[PDB]
Enzyme design. Structure first.
Site, PDB file in Angstrom:
ATOM      1  N   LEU G  39       0.819  -1.213   0.000  1.00 19.67           N
ATOM      2  CA  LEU G  39       0.000   0.000   0.000  1.00 19.67           C
ATOM      3  C   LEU G  39       0.855   1.265   0.000  1.00 19.67           C
ATOM      4  O   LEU G  39       1.838   1.364   0.742  1.00 19.67           O
ATOM      5  CB  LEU G  39      -0.954   0.004   1.198  1.00 19.67           C
ATOM      6  N   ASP G  40       0.464   2.222  -0.841  1.00 18.83           N
ATOM      7  CA  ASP G  40       1.148   3.513  -0.964  1.00 18.83           C
ATOM      8  C   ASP G  40       0.772   4.472   0.171  1.00 18.83           C
ATOM      9  O   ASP G  40      -0.157   4.202   0.941  1.00 18.83           O
ATOM     10  CB  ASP G  40       0.841   4.143  -2.327  1.00 18.83           C
ATOM     11  N   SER G  41       1.506   5.583   0.265  1.00 18.05           N
ATOM     12  CA  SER G  41       1.271   6.625   1.274  1.00 18.05           C
ATOM     13  C   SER G  41      -0.075   7.338   1.097  1.00 18.05           C
ATOM     14  O   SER G  41      -0.724   7.693   2.084  1.00 18.05           O
ATOM     15  CB  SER G  41       2.413   7.646   1.267  1.00 18.05           C
TER      16      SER G  41
END
Lengths: 67, 58, 110, 166, 118, 55, 85, 169, 457
Positions: G39-41
């Site tokens: 998962l990205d920021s």
């Protein structure tokens, strides 16, 4: 079943009971006040004759409690 | 203004009873005299418009 | 029950010596009633459901049925009981079949 | 912090999007368009260019800022029951209840008395543990967690216990 | 009061001076919170806490009246025109209405025939 | 004569829960239903003088 | 209707499985989104907003950074909305 | 009765010719409720009236008339003024309720005609305009609060206007 | 009949044992108050004199009954206070109320102006000792000195006023003899004759100017809240304005014209401050300025309709403001501070007292005809006959009459109370009894308000 939100209640409900107990204690002359119109006659409209101006009650119309 | 036919509508209302909606003969009289009265009022406005055209010529 | 309340005012308003700008402004508002009434149906009720929450319960209660169904008598028979029984004064409908009489009904359609 | 300011604006932008669009399928279409706009600048780290975009993010958003946004149900501020529906009763009023009425349902009164005795004994131990934290002023930002396992109760005991029930 | 753009998130920079500025604000915020924390979370209290900030707020309006106002200047005279002034304003309003009324009673009656109350 | 007598009945029926509000007689859970029953008969007593008005 | 502790965890896991971006086999409940799940920021804010739409909508800006794991997010949502007695 | 005028007699008679139906809803409910509890209320009122039997006649209304008017005795003295000031206050309190009866006559006209309103009556309209105008001039209504000593000056003010206007014409 | 049993209350409290005191002072006072309604109400066309001129009859004063109503009520709310201190100190400050009751009966009964004056200023002495002692907060003396040096500075000109009238025009005495009075010729020498009679009553009945006498007396609390009811009695204690304006100067109303305009601005500006104020007692203190300002307007018009509204408002305010101060005392005994923002929480902690808070607040507004609708509206109706412009100013005041009451409600109707831990018991049996003994007499005045407004009614 749940415990739910709590109030005081005991102090609150007692005052309304203590108030109404003294309304009911003097609620008896209120009940007599109805029968005073029922049993005893109130007033009749009639012209006054020159004999006596005032006796007990001078001039009072309606209700025996007024006299 | 109507008077005569308007009084007949109250006569049906006087002896109306339960289910008073069924009264069409008296209701039709109010739609006949007032329509003629509105036409008479329209005739007075039309007469004023016709008089303005004749006065402009002289 | 709209014609027995709303439409009687619109037909009576046209035949008067009163203000013209006030009369023209009321005619736009009579057609404006259709927008927000459909904004309850088309915007929320009609079409695909928006889904407010996962697993939402909606059921008819015995208290609800006895209230809404008996309100339907009052919302339908209002133009039969109130309008007929009450004695009126001076009939307004006489002039302009297309300009005044039809304009009250055409505004709701348009 | 740079990371927090982007996330706070992005959280607002998604919830403000559903006010303009009506249907949920149209909402998902514009959501993918917003992702492509921010990922272009997210790839590289900048000190001047990224901060310039942050002030630029306020624009366009402020042009369409008031269409009466949806807060859905019970939300902090906004509309439709913020503090309503939940009147509640304080924990101080519970112990204030007079005898005779307190005798009715003794299971709730006896269990609360046991928790009150435990809270009174732990209060002396919690006071020494709170000042044991290295700061030597009073406190730094937030309250510190408990270190001891035997004594339990992390600083505040009445913070989480007894709040509100709808 | 409001400007052209509403202030909420307008004009913000990280820098070095602003980073220490938020550290100064949290230093007092945590200090005044912990003394509240020590007073709230104990059953031995039972009562209403004082708080020196709230008492000084009530003291700002109830007291500090005559310690102030020692520089009167031109600001105090402008406030006097907004106070004693409007009292003189109605003097040319109520008298003109009364002189209008008093002339009508003596000559050319304007009062209603069906008037008896007061 | 019936028009004057029946008109006050509608006024008295709405005040009867207020007269029984101040303790008087104990009513558990029945008090919300007591308001419903008071107005139900108040409608019937108000229908008759309106029917008299048409006549 | 009242919400259960076992039911709330199953409801949160069902929404995460149909997200398409995250694998249904890789993450179940105990695995955190910060390290284990890809998962990205910016991805974490979008996933938290979708979870609020299904249940009772309440998400603080300050508490958004603290919540990352699905097991932790299910407990934080239940405690704030008052669940399991 | 006697003092109150009102209408002489009301007609009120139903015909009912159009439509058979269930006779009339107004007529059926009137006959039913007359014997239901209206007859019981009349019986209970008669039972209490008969139970009274002995009743006192009583004087009710008091006399006391004139005893020298205020515009006959002058100079500040308690012996003469007090009887005169009580007489004026007696008249002022009665005249407050004299207007009330005439006001109620106009109240009775409004309901009984309804649609006519101002087209008919006329007698009650003329009676109200004559009294109120006289009440405005004679019984204060302009000369502050009630005072018997100030009333003589109010009567002198009206008398001065009558002497000045008639002399010119 | 009225005086003598009131004087016998003084040996009652001292002779009785230390355990009792409060039982004897309250019970015996209630039966004397019953007998006041028994005899005083009887009157003919013009109200005939009682006896010799020591204490006389009532002509337009049902306000004496209010003093008899507070006669036991000035002891009920003071029960929470005084109990901590000495037994001899308890007996002293009950007898100071008895002395107040002794002088307050004498003011309303005695139909005089010469001997009335030495009873008018005589009420100030027991209240001074009451205010200067038992004050929980400081500046007792910055309110105690201001209590006299406002009143006595205005009332001492009555010695040069009243005596000047009796030396020239017969004698003042009975007032029933006062028909010797000739109308004033209106000259520059007659200006200070009118001002000296007015300025005495311009202080006790607060205006816009010289009004700071009242808020200092209320904010700096004497004893608990029962003595603040006596401060309400001092406002209505200057009732002689009903008597002086009608009798002594009937022709003089041209000089009244600037004083109405002062009191008219003492309605908007006095109400505006009564909005953003911090103290709970102060928000009753400034609303009491405007409510009594309505009466001053009514007096100076001199119309028969205005005196009806004037006499009504004297009784209306005397049992509504005193009711509000008892509610302020009930929060002062629990929270121990008069701050509105800090003392926040009704219904949740105070379930039954909140309904008394509602009934007291709404009575300041024009409710169904209790007494204030017969009070306020009667003045507004009478002001239009004076001038048409008045209701434009008076109508704005009717908006802000809600802003006294509702702002007092809302700032207490928040169920937070996070900082507050006290107020365990909502109200004692005596505390709820206080609230009922103020509103229920006004609720009985709904049936017959003849004994609420009677100057030739």
């Amino acid at each position: 079943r749940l415990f739910i939100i709590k109030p005081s209640g005991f102090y609150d409900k007692r005052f309304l009971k203590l108030l109404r107990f003294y309304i009911l204690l003097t609620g008896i002359p209120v009940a007599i006040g109805i029968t005073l119109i029922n049993v005893x006659x109130x007033x009749x409209x009639x012209x006054x004759x020159x004999x006596x101006x005032x006796x007990x009650x001078x001039x009072x119309x309606x209700x025996x409690x007024x006299x | 203004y109507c008077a005569h036919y308007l009084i007949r509508f109250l006569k049906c209302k006087r002896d109306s009873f339960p289910n008073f909606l069924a009264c069409k003969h008296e209701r039709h009289d109010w739609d006949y005299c007032e329509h003629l009265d509105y036409v008479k009022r329209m005739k007075e406005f039309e007469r004023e418009r016709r008089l303005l055209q004749r006065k402009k010529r002289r | 029950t709209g014609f027995y309340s709303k439409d009687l005012i619109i037909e009576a308003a046209n035949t008067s010596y009163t203000n013209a700008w006030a009369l023209l402004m009321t005619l736009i508002a009579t057609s404006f009633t259709a927008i927000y009434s459909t904004r309850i149906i088309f915007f929320a009720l009609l079409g695909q459901p928006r889904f407010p929450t996962l697993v939402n319960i909606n059921e008819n209660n015995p208290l609800l049925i006895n209230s809404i169904k008996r309100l339907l008598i009052g919302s339908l028979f209002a133009g039969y009981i109130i309008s007929n029984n009450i004695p009126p004064t001076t009939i307004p409908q006489m002039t302009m079949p297309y300009y005044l009489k039809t304009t009250a009904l055409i505004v709701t359609i348009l | 912090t740079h990371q927090q300011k982007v996330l706070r604006l992005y959280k607002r932008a998604l919830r403000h999007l559903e006010s303009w669009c009506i249907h949920r399928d149209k909402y998902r279409y514009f959501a993918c368009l917003l992702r492509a706009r921010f990922d272009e600048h997210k790839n590289e780290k900048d000190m001047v260019k990224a901060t310039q975009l942050l002030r630029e993010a306020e624009e366009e958003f402020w042009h369409g800022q008031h269409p009466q946004p949806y807060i859905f149900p019970e939300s902090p501020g906004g509309t439709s029951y913020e503090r309503y529906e939940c009147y509640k009763v304080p924990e101080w009023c519970l112990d204030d209840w007079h005898p005779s009425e307190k005798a009715m349902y003794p299971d709730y009164f006896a269990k609360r008395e046991q928790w009150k005795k435990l809270r009174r004994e732990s209060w002396e131990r919690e006071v020494x543990x709170x000042x044991x934290x290295x700061x030597x002023x009073x406190x730094x930002x937030x309250x510190x967690x408990x270190x001891x396992x035997x004594x339990x109760x992390x600083x505040x005991x009445x913070x989480x216990x007894x709040x509100x029930x709808x | 009061x409001x400007x052209x753009x509403x202030x909420x998130x307008x004009x913000x920079x990280x820098x070095x001076x602003x980073x220490x500025x938020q550290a100064e604000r949290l230093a007092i915020r945590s200090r005044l919170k912990r003394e509240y924390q020590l007073q709230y979370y104990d059953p031995s209290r039972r009562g209403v806490i004082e708080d020196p900030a709230l008492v000084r707020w009530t003291y700002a309006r109830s007291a500090n009246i005559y310690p102030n106002f020692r520089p009167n200047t031109k600001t105090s005279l402008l406030g006097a025109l907004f106070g004693i002034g409007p009292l003189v304003f109605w003097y040319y309003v109520f008298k003109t209405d009364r002189d209008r009324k008093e002339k009508l009673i003596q000559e050319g009656k304007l009062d209603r025939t069906f008037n008896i109350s007061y | 004569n019936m028009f004057s007598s029946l008109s006050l009945v509608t006024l008295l029926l709405l005040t009867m829960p207020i007269m029984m509000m101040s303790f008087n007689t104990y009513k558990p859970s029945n008090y919300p239903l007591y308001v419903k029953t008071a107005i139900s008969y108040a409608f019937i007593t108000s229908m008759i003088p309106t029917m008299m008005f048409i006549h | 209707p009242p919400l259960t502790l076992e039911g709330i965890k199953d409801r949160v896991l069902y929404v995460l499985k149909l997200y398409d971006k995250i694998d249904p086999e890789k993450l179940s409940v105990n695995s955190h989104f910060m390290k284990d799940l890809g998962l990205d920021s910016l991805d974490q804010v979008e996933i938290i907003m979708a979870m609020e739409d299904e249940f009772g909508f309440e998400i603080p800006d300050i508490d958004a950074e603290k919540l990352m794991c699905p097991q932790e997010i299910v407990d934080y949502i239940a405690d704030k909305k008052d669940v399991y007695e | 009765x006697x003092x109150x005028x009102x209408x002489x007699x009301x007609x009120x008679x139903x015909x009912x010719x159009x439509x058979x139906x269930x006779x009339x809803x107004x007529x059926x409910x009137x006959x039913x409720x007359x014997x239901x509890x209206x007859x019981x209320x009349x019986x209970x009122x008669x039972x209490x009236x008969x139970x009274x039997x002995x009743x006192x006649x009583x004087x009710x209304x008091x006399x006391x008339x004139x005893x020298x008017x205020x515009x006959x005795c002058q100079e500040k003295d308690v012996l003469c003024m007090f009887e005169a000031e009580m007489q004026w206050r007696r008249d002022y309190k009665v005249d407050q309720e004299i207007v009330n009866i005439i006001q109620e006559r106009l109240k009775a006209c409004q309901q009984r005609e309804g649609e006519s309103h101002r087209q008919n009556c006329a007698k009650e309209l003329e009676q109200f305009t004559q009294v109120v105008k006289a009440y405005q001039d004679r019984y204060x209504x302009x000369x502050x609060x009630x005072x018997x000593x100030x009333x003589x000056x109010x009567x002198x003010x009206x008398x001065x206007x009558x002497x000045x206007x008639x002399x010119x014409x | 009949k009225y005086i003598i049993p009131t004087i016998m209350l003084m040996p009652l409290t001292w002779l009785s044992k230390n355990n009792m005191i409060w039982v004897n002072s309250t019970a015996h006072s209630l039966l004397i108050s019953f007998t006041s309604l028994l005899l005083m109400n009887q009157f003919g066309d013009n109200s005939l004199n009682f006896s010799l001129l020591f204490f006389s009859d009532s002509l337009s004063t049902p306000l004496l009954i209010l003093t008899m109503w507070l006669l036991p009520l000035m002891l009920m709310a003071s029960q929470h206070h005084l109990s901590k201190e000495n037994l001899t100190r308890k007996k002293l400050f009950i007898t100071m109320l008895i002395s107040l009751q002794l002088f307050l009966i004498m003011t309303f009964t005695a139909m005089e102006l010469i001997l009335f004056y030495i009873l008018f200023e005589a009420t100030l002495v027991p209240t001074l000792i009451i205010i200067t002692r038992w004050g929980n907060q400081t500046e007792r003396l910055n309110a105690g000195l201001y209590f006299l040096f406002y009143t006595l500075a205005g009332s001492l000109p009555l010695l040069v006023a009243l005596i000047y009238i009796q030396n020239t025009v017969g004698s003042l005495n009975f007032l029933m003899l006062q028909y010797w009075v000739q109308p004033v010729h209106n000259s520059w020498s007659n200006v200070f004759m009118w001002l000296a009679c007015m300025m005495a009553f311009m202080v006790k009945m607060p205006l816009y100017g010289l009004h700071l006498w009242l808020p200092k007396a209320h904010v700096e609390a004497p004893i608990a809240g029962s003595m603040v009811l006596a401060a309400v009695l001092l406002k209505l204690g200057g009732y002689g304005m009903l008597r002086i304006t009608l009798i002594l100067n009937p022709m003089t109303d041209f000089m009244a014209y600037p004083f109405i305009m002062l009191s008219l601005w003492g309605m908007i500006m006095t109400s505006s401050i009564c909005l953003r104020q911090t103290d709970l007692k102060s928000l009753i203190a400034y609303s009491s300025v405007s409510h009594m300002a309505l009466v001053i307007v009514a007096i100076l018009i001199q119309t028969p309709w205005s005196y009806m509204g004037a006499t009504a408002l004297m009784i209306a305010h005397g049992l509504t403001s005193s009711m509000l101060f008892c509610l302020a005392n009930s929060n002062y005994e629990r929270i121990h501070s008069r701050t509105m923002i800090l003392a926040r929480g009704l219904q949740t902690l105070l379930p039954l007292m909140a309904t008394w808070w509602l009934l007291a607040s709404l009575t300041n507004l024009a409710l169904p005809p209790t007494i204030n609708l017969i009070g306020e509206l009667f003045v507004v109706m009478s002001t239009f006959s004076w001038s048409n412009i008045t209701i434009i100013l008076m109508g704005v005041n009717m908006v802000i009459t809600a802003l006294y009451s509702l702002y007092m409600l809302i700032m207490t109707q928040r169920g937070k109370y996070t900082y507050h831990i006290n107020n365990i018991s909502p109200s004692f049996t005596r505390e709820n009894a206080l609230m009922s003994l103020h509103i229920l007499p006004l609720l009985l005045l709904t049936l017959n308000p003849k004994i609420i407004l009677g100057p030739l009614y």
